[PDB]
Design an enzyme around this catalytic site. Structure first.
Site, PDB file in Angstrom:
ATOM      1  N   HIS A  43      28.227  53.727   9.678  1.00  0.00           N
ATOM      2  CA  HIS A  43      27.977  55.033   9.304  1.00  0.00           C
ATOM      3  C   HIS A  43      26.469  55.483   8.658  1.00  0.00           C
ATOM      4  CE1 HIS A  43      32.336  55.560   9.218  1.00  0.00           C
ATOM      5  NE2 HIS A  43      32.513  54.365   8.705  1.00  0.00           N
ATOM      6  N   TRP A  95      27.311  58.311   5.875  1.00  0.00           N
ATOM      7  CA  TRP A  95      27.999  57.641   4.593  1.00  0.00           C
ATOM      8  C   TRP A  95      27.424  56.553   3.919  1.00  0.00           C
ATOM      9  CZ3 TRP A  95      30.214  61.034   1.510  1.00  0.00           C
ATOM     10  CH2 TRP A  95      30.638  61.972   2.254  1.00  0.00           C
ATOM     11  N   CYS A 110      33.308  72.557   8.708  1.00  0.00           N
ATOM     12  CA  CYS A 110      33.563  73.224  10.100  1.00  0.00           C
ATOM     13  C   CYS A 110      32.347  73.224  10.647  1.00  0.00           C
ATOM     14  CB  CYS A 110      34.382  74.155  10.160  1.00  0.00           C
ATOM     15  SG  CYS A 110      34.835  74.814  11.763  1.00  0.00           S
ATOM     16  N   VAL A 111      32.358  72.644  11.963  1.00  0.00           N
ATOM     17  CA  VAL A 111      30.986  72.775  12.945  1.00  0.00           C
ATOM     18  C   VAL A 111      31.347  73.309  14.306  1.00  0.00           C
ATOM     19  CG1 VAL A 111      29.205  71.321  14.368  1.00  0.00           C
ATOM     20  CG2 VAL A 111      29.281  71.029  11.861  1.00  0.00           C
ATOM     21  N   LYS A 154      25.664  66.712  16.658  1.00  0.00           N
ATOM     22  CA  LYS A 154      24.357  66.935  16.581  1.00  0.00           C
ATOM     23  C   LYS A 154      23.896  66.458  15.142  1.00  0.00           C
ATOM     24  CE  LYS A 154      24.579  69.939  20.259  1.00  0.00           C
ATOM     25  NZ  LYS A 154      23.569  69.429  21.241  1.00  0.00           N
ATOM     26  N   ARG A 155      24.674  65.887  14.416  1.00  0.00           N
ATOM     27  CA  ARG A 155      24.325  65.546  13.025  1.00  0.00           C
ATOM     28  C   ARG A 155      24.007  66.738  12.238  1.00  0.00           C
ATOM     29  NH1 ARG A 155      26.393  60.486  12.836  1.00  0.00           N
ATOM     30  NH2 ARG A 155      25.290  60.263  10.970  1.00  0.00           N
ATOM     31  N   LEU A 156      24.844  67.853  12.328  1.00  0.00           N
ATOM     32  CA  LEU A 156      24.936  68.890  11.469  1.00  0.00           C
ATOM     33  C   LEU A 156      25.865  68.809  10.192  1.00  0.00           C
ATOM     34  CD1 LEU A 156      23.515  71.716  11.036  1.00  0.00           C
ATOM     35  CD2 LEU A 156      25.427  72.505  12.680  1.00  0.00           C
ATOM     36  N   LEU A 188      44.668  72.669  -0.318  1.00  0.00           N
ATOM     37  CA  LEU A 188      45.099  73.703   0.543  1.00  0.00           C
ATOM     38  C   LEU A 188      44.505  73.713   2.037  1.00  0.00           C
ATOM     39  CD1 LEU A 188      44.349  76.826  -2.228  1.00  0.00           C
ATOM     40  CD2 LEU A 188      46.538  75.582  -1.411  1.00  0.00           C
TER      41      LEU A 188
HETATM   42  C1  LIG Z   1      28.981  66.475  -6.162  1.00  0.00           C
HETATM   43  C2  LIG Z   1      29.199  67.390  -5.012  1.00  0.00           C
HETATM   44  C3  LIG Z   1      29.493  66.835  -3.884  1.00  0.00           C
HETATM   45  C4  LIG Z   1      29.853  67.745  -2.666  1.00  0.00           C
HETATM   46  C5  LIG Z   1      30.026  67.074  -1.370  1.00  0.00           C
HETATM   47  C6  LIG Z   1      31.242  66.069  -1.341  1.00  0.00           C
HETATM   48  C7  LIG Z   1      31.501  65.174   0.093  1.00  0.00           C
HETATM   49  C8  LIG Z   1      32.272  66.095   0.925  1.00  0.00           C
HETATM   50  C9  LIG Z   1      32.325  65.548   2.459  1.00  0.00           C
HETATM   51  C10 LIG Z   1      32.866  66.553   3.284  1.00  0.00           C
HETATM   52  C11 LIG Z   1      34.668  66.878   3.055  1.00  0.00           C
HETATM   53  C12 LIG Z   1      35.500  67.557   4.083  1.00  0.00           C
HETATM   54  C13 LIG Z   1      37.003  67.657   3.803  1.00  0.00           C
HETATM   55  C14 LIG Z   1      37.228  68.665   5.120  1.00  0.00           C
HETATM   56  O1  LIG Z   1      37.139  69.829   5.185  1.00  0.00           O
HETATM   57  S1  LIG Z   1      38.204  67.790   6.097  1.00  0.00           S
HETATM   58  C15 LIG Z   1      38.040  68.925   7.567  1.00  0.00           C
HETATM   59  C16 LIG Z   1      37.185  68.725   8.434  1.00  0.00           C
HETATM   60  N1  LIG Z   1      36.833  69.500   9.497  1.00  0.00           N
HETATM   61  C17 LIG Z   1      37.354  69.513  10.676  1.00  0.00           C
HETATM   62  O2  LIG Z   1      38.244  68.153  11.109  1.00  0.00           O
HETATM   63  C18 LIG Z   1      37.413  70.618  11.771  1.00  0.00           C
HETATM   64  C19 LIG Z   1      36.840  69.994  13.209  1.00  0.00           C
HETATM   65  N2  LIG Z   1      35.862  69.354  13.232  1.00  0.00           N
HETATM   66  C20 LIG Z   1      34.583  69.585  12.911  1.00  0.00           C
HETATM   67  O3  LIG Z   1      34.377  70.870  12.720  1.00  0.00           O
HETATM   68  C21 LIG Z   1      33.331  68.618  12.940  1.00  0.00           C
HETATM   69  O4  LIG Z   1      34.081  67.636  13.892  1.00  0.00           O
HETATM   70  C22 LIG Z   1      33.064  68.015  11.881  1.00  0.00           C
HETATM   71  C23 LIG Z   1      32.407  69.180  10.730  1.00  0.00           C
HETATM   72  C24 LIG Z   1      34.315  67.376  10.892  1.00  0.00           C
HETATM   73  C25 LIG Z   1      32.248  66.799  11.958  1.00  0.00           C
HETATM   74  O5  LIG Z   1      31.067  67.472  12.853  1.00  0.00           O
HETATM   75  P1  LIG Z   1      30.619  66.453  14.109  1.00  0.00           P
HETATM   76  O6  LIG Z   1      31.747  66.078  14.459  1.00  0.00           O
HETATM   77  O7  LIG Z   1      29.915  67.671  14.724  1.00  0.00           O
HETATM   78  O8  LIG Z   1      29.741  65.420  13.770  1.00  0.00           O
HETATM   79  P2  LIG Z   1      28.062  65.469  13.234  1.00  0.00           P
HETATM   80  O9  LIG Z   1      27.508  64.659  14.231  1.00  0.00           O
HETATM   81  O10 LIG Z   1      27.667  66.717  12.704  1.00  0.00           O
HETATM   82  O11 LIG Z   1      28.073  64.261  11.890  1.00  0.00           O
HETATM   83  C26 LIG Z   1      28.897  62.842  12.005  1.00  0.00           C
HETATM   84  C27 LIG Z   1      29.139  62.412  10.530  1.00  0.00           C
HETATM   85  O12 LIG Z   1      29.914  63.151  10.090  1.00  0.00           O
HETATM   86  C28 LIG Z   1      31.106  62.190   9.368  1.00  0.00           C
HETATM   87  N3  LIG Z   1      32.415  63.133   9.554  1.00  0.00           N
HETATM   88  C29 LIG Z   1      32.994  63.293  10.429  1.00  0.00           C
HETATM   89  N4  LIG Z   1      34.236  64.137  10.056  1.00  0.00           N
HETATM   90  C30 LIG Z   1      34.064  63.995   8.876  1.00  0.00           C
HETATM   91  C31 LIG Z   1      34.996  64.653   7.596  1.00  0.00           C
HETATM   92  N5  LIG Z   1      36.113  65.328   7.936  1.00  0.00           N
HETATM   93  N6  LIG Z   1      34.728  64.605   6.383  1.00  0.00           N
HETATM   94  C32 LIG Z   1      33.308  63.936   6.216  1.00  0.00           C
HETATM   95  N7  LIG Z   1      32.372  63.497   6.843  1.00  0.00           N
HETATM   96  C33 LIG Z   1      33.041  63.428   8.291  1.00  0.00           C
HETATM   97  C34 LIG Z   1      31.187  61.168  10.359  1.00  0.00           C
HETATM   98  O13 LIG Z   1      31.587  60.275  10.000  1.00  0.00           O
HETATM   99  C35 LIG Z   1      29.521  61.034  10.448  1.00  0.00           C
HETATM  100  O14 LIG Z   1      28.753  60.576   9.565  1.00  0.00           O
HETATM  101  P3  LIG Z   1      28.685  58.948   9.701  1.00  0.00           P
HETATM  102  O15 LIG Z   1      29.733  57.994  10.299  1.00  0.00           O
HETATM  103  O16 LIG Z   1      27.427  58.767  11.053  1.00  0.00           O
HETATM  104  O17 LIG Z   1      28.079  58.256   8.685  1.00  0.00           O
END
Ligand SMILES: CCCCCCCCCCCCCC(=O)SCCNC(=O)CCNC(=O)[C@H](O)C(C)(C)COP(=O)(O)OP(=O)(O)OC[C@H]1O[C@@H](n2cnc3c(N)ncnc32)[C@H](O)[C@@H]1OP(=O)(O)O
Ligand SMILES: Cc1nn(C)c(C)c1NS(=O)(=O)c1c(Cl)cc(Br)cc1Cl
Ligand SMILES: [Cl-]
Length: 411
Positions: A2, A5, A160-161, A168-170, A411
């Protein structure tokens, strides 16, 4: 591996989480002044945008991004279609922080490309009961109780991306920017959920589904048919009869919640949620916001007798787009929200939720096995689904718990 992560203050493996005995922070202690002032860098063709989620047109832009690009099932048959009114409800609770709503736009045309949202929550997230017992055995009560006070944290949702920008790592950049904005407000933990496995859940619960309109659910391949139904002349007529519900509520004294119910509903809910290890603490304003009826969004009913509210239930609506079937646009789902029973069995309370939902046109009632949801699955004919909702914290070590010890509804 990861690449993102592994750089963050979360437990990194199941084995590490199995070893955790006390609640508390993971990261070095920091102050607001240690956090960068300026937004995280992003490519020059993009810009950060903080939508105004009470402005109809900003809510509509976020609505369309999610309609077209948010969560699908694994076979791309359904995609959530949160409504504009639901998004205003969910994103703007009392004392929300507008800066925790984070979007990326293309700088040229202002095309919305990505979103993440944070909202405040007051969460009980101290050491769980079974771990407090161990701590007592071992003379470590003080350590185990250190973080018992309910904490003002961030709840993240709606990451959501856009489909064209995937992989693209956004999403890491959005996560790091929301982290920044939340830490600038002196908050250092978050809670979030996902239907996928990430490092590292503190709880996981299966989804369950109660068919309200089985002919439609079968047509769109949400549900199928037990092979046992083949032994029948007419599998589908049998199916309708199996899931049939009364046309009207059975509990006398059930009616819709009104504003004057807020203090009683707060008291019976908070008495009930205190029994679980992880749960929210709600003020009267937050009860009003999250529970008072809003058409098309949240539905809440109380049992009142002798002028006293003694039970209540709520459910909220998320339709999903039916992607591949020409003949239905939407699957209209009701999700079990908060409830509390003091006068009747929980199954009898939740039967009237199913009655009300069906009468209102819902196709299915969904829930995760949190709270005491397992206590009415078989009698009310819920079936387990293929989804699992995993619960996570950001910057919080927390022992593994059963999902029946989680009282936070997402939600
Ligand atoms: C103190 C305050 C803290 C605030 C923040 C707290 C943390 C919040 C964390 C977020 C909580 C969200 C809760 C909800 O909303 S869960 C709902 C998530 N949304 C969707 O599933 C909608 C459909 N999918 C997408 O829009 C995209 O595929 C997403 C945006 C999910 C990933 O975009 P993309 O597919 O274009 O990938 P990338 O190249 O940009 O990035 C790849 C990296 O992303 C990691 N990844 C993939 N899916 C998730 C996921 N659900 N939570 C956390 N991480 C996720 C993945 O392991 C990888 O990291 P690593 O494995 O390389 O290490
Ligand atoms: C109806 C529906 N909409 N979407 C977007 C999905 C995934 C479903 N199917 S579902 O049964 O209700 C479900 C839901 Cl809500 C949440 C998860 Br996580 C996994 C599943 Cl598989
Ligand atoms: Cl399913």
């Amino acid at each position: 591996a990861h690449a993102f992560w592994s750089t963050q203050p979360v437990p990194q493996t199941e084995d590490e989480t199995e070893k955790i005995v006390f609640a508390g922070p993971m990261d070095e202690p920091k102050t607001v002044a240690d956090i960068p002032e300026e937004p995280y860098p992003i490519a020059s063709t993009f810009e950060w945008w903080t939508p105004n989620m009470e402005a109809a047109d900003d809510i509509h832009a976020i609505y369309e991004l999610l309609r077209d690009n948010y969560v699908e099932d694994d076979d791309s048959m359904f995609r959530f279609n949160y409504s504009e009114e639901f998004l205003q409800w969910a994103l703007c609770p009392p004392n929300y922080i507008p800066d925790w709503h984070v979007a990326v736009r293309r700088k040229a045309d202002k095309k919305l490309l990505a979103f993440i949202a944070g909202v405040p929550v007051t969460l009980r997230m101290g050491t769980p009961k079974y771990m407090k017992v161990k701590a007592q055995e071992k003379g470590e009560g003080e350590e185990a109780a250190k973080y018992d006070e309910p904490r003002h944290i961030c709840e993240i949702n709606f990451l959501c991306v856009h489909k064209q920008l995937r992989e693209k790592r956004l999403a890491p950049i959005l996560i790091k920017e929301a982290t920044r904005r939340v830490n600038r407000t002196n908050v250092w933990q978050a809670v979030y959920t996902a239907g996928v496995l990430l490092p590292t859940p503190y709880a996981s619960g299966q989804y369950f589904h109660r068919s309200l309109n089985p002919e439609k659910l079968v047509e769109i391949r949400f549900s199928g048919i037990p092979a046992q139904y083949q032994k029948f002349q007419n599998p589908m007529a049998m199916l309708k009869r199996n899931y049939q519900l009364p046309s009207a509520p059975k509990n006398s004294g059930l009616r819709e919640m009104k504003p004057s119910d807020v203090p009683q509903v707060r008291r019976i809910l908070m008495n009930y949620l205190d029994s679980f290890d992880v749960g929210p603490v709600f003020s009267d304003a937050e009860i009003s916001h999250y529970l008072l009826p809003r058409d098309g969004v949240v539905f809440t009913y109380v049992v009142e007798n002798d002028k006293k509210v003694t039970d209540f239930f709520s459910f909220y609506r998320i339709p999903s787009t039916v992607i591949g079937n020409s003949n239905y646009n939407l699957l209209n789902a009701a999700y079990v929200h908060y409830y509390a029973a003091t006068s009747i069995p929980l199954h009898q309370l939740i039967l009237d939720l199913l009655i009300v939902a069906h009468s209102r046109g819902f196709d299915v009632c969904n829930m995760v096995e949190i709270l005491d949801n397992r206590s009415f699955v078989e009698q009310l004919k819920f079936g387990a689904g293929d989804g699992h909702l995993r619960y996570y914290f950001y910057n919080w070590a927390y022992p593994k718990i059963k999902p029946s010890q989680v009282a936070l509804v997402m939600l």
